[PDB]
Subunit: 215 residues, 4 copies
Amino acid sequence: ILSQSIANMQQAEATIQSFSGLPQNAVNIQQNVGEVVAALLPQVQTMQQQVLAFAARLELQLTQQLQQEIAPIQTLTAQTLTASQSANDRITQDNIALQRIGVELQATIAGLQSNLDGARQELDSLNKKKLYLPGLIALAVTLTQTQNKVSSLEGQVNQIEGQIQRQQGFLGQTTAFSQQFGSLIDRVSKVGNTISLLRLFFTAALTEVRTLQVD
Amino acid sequence: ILSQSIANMQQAEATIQSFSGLPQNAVNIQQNVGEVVAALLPQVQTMQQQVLAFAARLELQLTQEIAPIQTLTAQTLTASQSANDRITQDNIALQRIGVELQATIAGLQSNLDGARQELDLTQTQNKVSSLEGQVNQIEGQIQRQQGFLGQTTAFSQQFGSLIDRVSKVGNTISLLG
Amino acid sequence: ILSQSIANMQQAEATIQSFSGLPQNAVNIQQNVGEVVAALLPQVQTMQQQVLAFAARLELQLTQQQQEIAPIQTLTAQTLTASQSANDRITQDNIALQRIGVELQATIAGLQSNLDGARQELDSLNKKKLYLLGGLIALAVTLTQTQNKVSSLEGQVNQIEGQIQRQQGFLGQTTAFSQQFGSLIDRVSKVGNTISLLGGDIAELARLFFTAALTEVRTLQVDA
Amino acid sequence: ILSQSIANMQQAEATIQSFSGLPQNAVNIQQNVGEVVAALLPQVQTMQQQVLAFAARLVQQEIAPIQTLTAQTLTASQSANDRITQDNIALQRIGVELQATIAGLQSNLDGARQELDVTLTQTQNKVSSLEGQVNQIEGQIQRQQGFLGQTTAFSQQFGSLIDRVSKVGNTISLLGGDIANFFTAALTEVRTLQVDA
């Protein structure tokens, strides 16, 4: 789960670097992601090996019998937690802000799709006249005038369709990335809890080492 | 298409009129949608009878009527255009309310993540339980509002088909005049 | 969450019943959602009362210091297995609809190809029309035959766009309904479990096991 | 629209080439889009320029090349697109079956995960695996939702380009009908051909 979390985030990374010409909150997420996968994720890989190592010793010392060591791996599980949470908290707010922009694009391509349908209707009409048809001369300039009018609004809209398309894609990525990171923070947190909750003395502790070892 | 439109617009009204408790903009649509389904659509069904008869009493005399029909076509087209433009604005108002709810589950979900990680002692237990309960409240409202938005969006789009089709009948009536 | 999921499950029902002319799979869900709201949710509410009441009685007895765990733990198990069953049937019917969903995608891609083939045909005929402006009367009959086929496929596309939209909409609902129901099962199970470990505990070392029993009585109450 | 269709198809394709370790239907699309960007789009640029130069101004000699080009550009573009649209449907089928395999896993995980809520470690391992297994199917399903997100967007932009190209290819035909035979019609058709590109 740690590892799959890590692996998945690693694979979304390149896909999130692939987008160009997105808003600043999207560039923020791009930068954040890059820092996490480069710096933060190997940190989590390091704590996990130190946790599996600290636990491998103490398991045997517990079985046999039937602290000083904890400290530096408590410290590390707590930074990793903190750091993870705050990077991820920075993604959550950037995601929310793209959501708001998402919507405002929608309302703008209202105007552009409502006005385009006036011109596409006007041109449909001219285009029936042309096809059924002195008459043809009286229609010719108006036709082209209206053709120009639709292509133009059709260009403007297709512009914003591209923006909307891109930002929806992007957001799919960073939401997914957030899903996974969260899974990573739950499990780090979980290992945080147990590095604290460390015959019936050693028996209890041994379950806490085993859970550590499975987590 | 015109028959297909009207009929699909009938089903989507019945679904839209099943939601209760929704915000300001969501009732605005609920009322608009029954207006269309109850009165405006009959006027589209009507004009079809009359357009198709007009279109039948020329077919004979190829093998005065123009104005009283193009007037009812062009009024139907315009009444529909404004009603659909109205629903459209309310939709983006609901999207905003939507995103705002995403912002609130966000704020709650953190305070929960905090107290819930601290769970894993009746003090913690109640604090989380309230925060759990609360975020299941904001999700319930989110799912329903997406549900509702899905149905008005599907209403609107189907309206626009009927708009295409009505406009097109008018354009032919126009050319024959 | 017990009570809040139930609300969300209740509000959503009416909406789920409102859909007409949907595939058999949707029709099963509809019927199931009907029975869940009618029969189970009231039985969940009864369980919740009986547990809250049991918990109040044993709470005082503990901060002062089996027969009436039997009835109230079978009820809990019964409520779980019934709920899980209903719910599993909603999972299996949704995936079926997800499959129907993609085949509909395949249909409309088919109706599209054919729709483009027609459009061309008309436009091939309207080439032969530019020639005949050199039996342009003959072509008017074969110009509506095709005008009428292009119209027909557009009508079919349109029919299958509505079907797609309408079904996706319903998946929207029954997925939300299911997400909620899972939250219920989670809570019922938690409740049942705590009512087992209670039994277990309740079955000087006394003052300890009693103060644990209290722990699980207290949580019982927070959880129901 | 032509340029805006191209530009969007380019941006879409960089993201599409970023996906890695995806099923075959995935890797097919990857290949098929990289082609479309490097092959079909240059020609679409070319033919836009050539129709525009031609549409400001014997002329049966001037249409002949520019008709077949358009008509060739169109037929390749429809083949590319139609093969994206099947890999599309096929990927969605892989997607749905992926939801199905969790629908079976997650059931027996719910079992063990309630059983958790000697003893503790038989429990814990199973839930570890079941949990990992399910969490893996999740990952694939997001990457695929992601991919399909993009090929679908690519495929819609493509559709919009193909349709214009089809519009400009039916005008050139119209125009050559008018010329060979009227000057007025031909004029209204070349003015339609200047608007489209």
